[PDB]
């Protein structure tokens with residue numbers, strides 16, 4: 001595989017969004033992956049409605065601001081036959097009744113693909129598919145205060161993940177400890193968090209924070 005990948009340079013990635021104080025990270029991860037695969041198909045990048053997912057994908061297993069899973073969001077888009085644009089169905093950071101309108105649907109999917117639970121498989125997927133939805137253990141103060149560099153949290157769990165994010169690439173940079181590889185990860189906490197809203201998370205360090213444990217993408 002390549003040593004470095006960044007799908008933002010290829011037009012696959014919308015700006016960083018802000019989920020607010022609603023536990024809807026799974027919806028932002030899912031819209032990010034679907035924005036990438038829709039762009040791969042149509043050559044058009046269109047921001048998608050997380051609120052549509054929060055309000056409407058309960059039947060697939062999601063629980064609004066109380067959490068959810070990207071694969072359940074991809075299943076909703078398939079079952080529902082569409083997903084509204086961000087513009088048409090803007091984000092309100094609280095769960096309400098479903099207001100999906102098919103006339104404003106701008107995306108579709110035909111299911112999803114789950115990646116084997118190995119960083120080598122995640123790397124192949126990021127290199128060939130586009131941005132990938134992943135789950136990580138983000139439950140540490142070090143993740144709140146991240147500014148730059150490669151994020152490594154010795155207490156991070158590889159099995160207990162609590163936050164969905166989007167891997168848009170990977171790369172390397174020289175470091176003191178010579179653990180130099182990272183996943184380039186788009187978060188949904190606004191652009192004031194991290195490096196313009198992104199974090200470089202340790203790569204090939206025993207599946208740090210579980211980044212390869214629940215990785216998937218929608219089939220478009």
Ligand SMILES: *[C@@H](O)[C@H](CCCC)NC(=O)[C@H](CC(C)C)NC(=O)OCc1ccccc1
Pocket residue numbers: 019022023024025026061062063065066067068069070134135136161162163164214
């Ligand atoms: C991220 O904002 C939220 C915060 C949840 C607490 C309010 N995290 C999730 O949604 C998390 C993401 C996965 C690890 C990818 N999932 C979650 O909390 O799921 C709970 C749940 C599981 C299955 C079905 C419904 C709810």
